Amino acid sequence: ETEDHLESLICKVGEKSACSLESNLEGLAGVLEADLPNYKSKILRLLCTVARLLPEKLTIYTTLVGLLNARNYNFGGEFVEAMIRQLKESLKANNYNEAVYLVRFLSDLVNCHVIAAPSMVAMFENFVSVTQEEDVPQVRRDWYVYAFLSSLPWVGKELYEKKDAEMDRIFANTESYLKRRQKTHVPMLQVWTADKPHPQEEYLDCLWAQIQKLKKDRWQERHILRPYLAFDSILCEALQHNLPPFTPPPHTEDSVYPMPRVIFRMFDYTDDPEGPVMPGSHSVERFVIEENLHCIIKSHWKERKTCAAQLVSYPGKNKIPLNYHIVEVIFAELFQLPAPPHIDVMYTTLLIELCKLQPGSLPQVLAQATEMLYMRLDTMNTTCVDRFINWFSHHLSNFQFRWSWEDWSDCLSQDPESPKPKFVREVLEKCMRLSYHQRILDIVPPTFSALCPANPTCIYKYGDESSNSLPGHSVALCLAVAFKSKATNDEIFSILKDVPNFNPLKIEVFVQTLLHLAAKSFSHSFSALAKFHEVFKTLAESDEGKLHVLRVMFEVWRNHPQMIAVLVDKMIRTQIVDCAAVANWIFSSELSRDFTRLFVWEILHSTIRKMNKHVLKIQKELEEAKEKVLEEQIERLQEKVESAQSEQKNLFLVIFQRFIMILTEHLVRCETDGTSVLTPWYKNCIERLQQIFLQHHQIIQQYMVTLENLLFTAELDPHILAVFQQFCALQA
Amino acid sequence: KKMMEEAKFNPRATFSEFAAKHAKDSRFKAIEKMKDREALFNEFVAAARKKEKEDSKTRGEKIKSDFFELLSNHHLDSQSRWSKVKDKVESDPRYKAVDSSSMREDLFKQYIEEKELERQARIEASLREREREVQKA
Amino acid sequence: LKALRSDSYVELSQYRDQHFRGDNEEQEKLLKKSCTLYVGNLSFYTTEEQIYELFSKSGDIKKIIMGLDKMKKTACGFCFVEYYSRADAENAMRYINGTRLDDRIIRTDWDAGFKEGRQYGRGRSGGQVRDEYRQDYDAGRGGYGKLA
Amino acid sequence: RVVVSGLPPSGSWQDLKDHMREAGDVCYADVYRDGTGVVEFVRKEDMTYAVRKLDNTKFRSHEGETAYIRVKVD
């Protein structure tokens, strides 16, 4: 019971009360002291937890650890003892993001008279000292600075009352360090390359610039609520403590540090003239506001309805254009370089839940942001655009596809390849897949018809062709007859024995015919593949066969991208074709004309994931089997791991070799015909290569020797190398 | 309490903000413990917010009540048009006392809504008996 | 660690596998380990293609089984979606449940598991039981309830 | 969804719903295994109540057959 009640109450304070917060902190303060005799360990646990899991409540709980320290010095000393232990653990386990919340909780305690202001400074001095450390990844040297700077919004003001001498010498080594960092990763992490309006800044530079405006403002920010900073009635006479000498954990080969980031920015106060002035991009208020909002989503991501509510009720010290901050932060997450913190579909419905909660004001802002995103499309990164298309099209389908399409009339007279028209075409294509062809033709104006998607009709070769000069024609006609008759494999094989030339012609007449007679539904085509599965495994026993199947299937369904995708997927899972073949198919000349369409990549990534999932699965089995006949298996599971990983490496190897080949071909041709290198085709192609790295950087890391010395070498065009070097900078 | 009367209301003021505004005031220092300063701060807000509510919604009932009293002076029925009445009452302090035009019109619309009634009740009872007899048949 | 674990959208519903064999205990053990979902309120004309496109947003789908009129053998207004992993089914439960599929608000529920015969409406008239007593008009489910 | 155990031999889910309704309102019922069954209520209030009040009660079938049924939250 009691155990239960404590955790309940510890949370109540953070939650929205119905009696001034200060009161609750007053009460809970004593209550907790009264229970210290019997429940010291639990309360000591509960607080260390809310400290690393409820950052958005940082100051409500620091206060609490204060009122307590103001009634039991020895208690505070124990809490601060745990915190350091808890912090050393998070660090050793590579859970750096959790650490920051700890390191930041300590910081604010200094404002609660619990930790010696001078004490904090000594630790930070050691954090920055990491910048000197020799032969360590920059992402490591980066995290300590970030942990330091991100704290100042809380500690800085009072941490400036003391040790300004070293609290100047620290900024000194920082400034020095900040100007010596390589920024190779920025181009690969920016949502937009255009900085004409608002620049997408490297996260440390942006924060550095933020501290400055604060420092030069005498460290006086006006947002961070402070519920335990008032030590003029109690906290004053409290006896602070001293954090033991903190020696940052030595960089090991098992260390993994957060990747660098780029600050997503799309709004400024002029985007909301008639609304409370929006904190500027370089104001700490902006940082803190987005930080809490990001943390709120991190705490409630699993429950969308609770989530919207915690966002909308966010407590701001001084009024701010909340709705705008909520939308900006959600897009900041959806478009997070390659992909955000949580599953993509979560942001879609989260936004819906917010529109249902603030019916009168959220929708307009969301409609304003959509407009702005569309207008800035020209320099948005391909990976984000895809995300934009899927979000918007899925969003539309929940609001009867109602949108003011004429607002985007400008796309109508642009090269079909330009980002705007292409974006519209893709969005519409997506809307069709969530409903049907005719429905979409009906929602857009007559002027847009040209951008609507083609009717997804099957294309039989030997069909009502009547153009019979084609090879295997009659053979196909027998097949059609057999299939409609509940023919068997051997029978079909027989029909096929009468085919003149791995036999390309046999494949084509089989596929063209089998698919045509199952073109009514996905479920028909599937069973079709399952029934005559044996035939497939025969005709396509070779890679040429595998490749030819994909080629004929594409010939048949080129007007129905969703069909093509589900078929390839089904074929891979039933081993009618393998990922290598799918990869070669993607870069094949037969797809050259559709190379930049979304479905092509949606398929390639879905193939890569199946490969990855597969590898992971077998690895686990071995893992479990190794944790125990039982041997003959581990012998076998080992072999399977080998093959799986080998085929995985080969998939990345081929994909990269193909990218290098087509990009070089383009670069050379251009550098010969003195033509522009920056074509729409190039943009998609170079950014698609970048995406391979973004989506699977973890797996790709395992191939550094091969990648760094065998593929992406110096003889390669710098435009291609650039992509590789950007990737390496992610964990450099 | 005096410390809070020197600032600008701020009913949703944080305790550390309130403590910053009144920290050098002697009525603030007069209370020994920080906890009791916060408790007085919390209660006075909660009693001021409780009173603003109860006050601004007896003024609401008083604005509305006055507006009706103004209208009661003119011979209004379901016919009468607000386009016409407006130009007759627009000078009154009870008309201006409603800070909006959309709402003076709604209040007006609300305000706007024996033998013949006996015959109507006759028709109603006849229809009821007819429905009952039709159901029985 | 603490109550942040809240996952109300993934919790078991009140519905029980109708013709299921085991205890309520055996049905519940299957439901908490399932990868297959029950999808309700579809229109009679909602296709497998649409279902695939919306439900794939939460993970890869293994199979989709359309609910049918036991006697007419036509789309009934419900279906079963089966994922390869429960994590993906949970996300559908979390972010797809309660949203629009083919212009109508749908509801998902955990399902013990598909078995031959689960695809047929148990509705007295052939369709879903739900439609026998519906007193509302629904042009996606054939107008008024069967008892009308 | 709750489960039922200890139902009569000559009984169906349709007749059971008439007994479960006492809790408030039922959404679906079933009787499989030739002994145990199941029921689906609307709200948790009426549901939790059924397992509380409508527990180990005496079911009465339309065939003049009575028995003891056990309700449980599933």
Ligand SMILES: C[n+]1cn([C@@H]2O[C@H](COP(=O)(O)OP(=O)(O)OP(=O)(O)OC[C@H]3O[C@@H](n4cnc5c(=O)[nH]c(N)nc54)[C@H](O)[C@@H]3O)[C@@H](O)[C@H]2O)c2nc(N)[nH]c(=O)c21
């Ligand atoms: C609704 N539902 C169906 N299936 C599956 O889909 C198939 C179609 O059969 P139905 O023909 O759809 O089947 P039942 O639900 O068996 O029977 P029933 O539970 O009695 O219940 C409720 C629906 O009918 C209504 N109803 C039932 N009896 C009455 C009654 O006497 N009066 C009134 N007014 N309404 C009633 C009620 O409103 C209710 O919501 C079957 O294979 C099922 O397994 C579900 N599977 C899961 N996991 N979750 C669900 O929520 C679910």
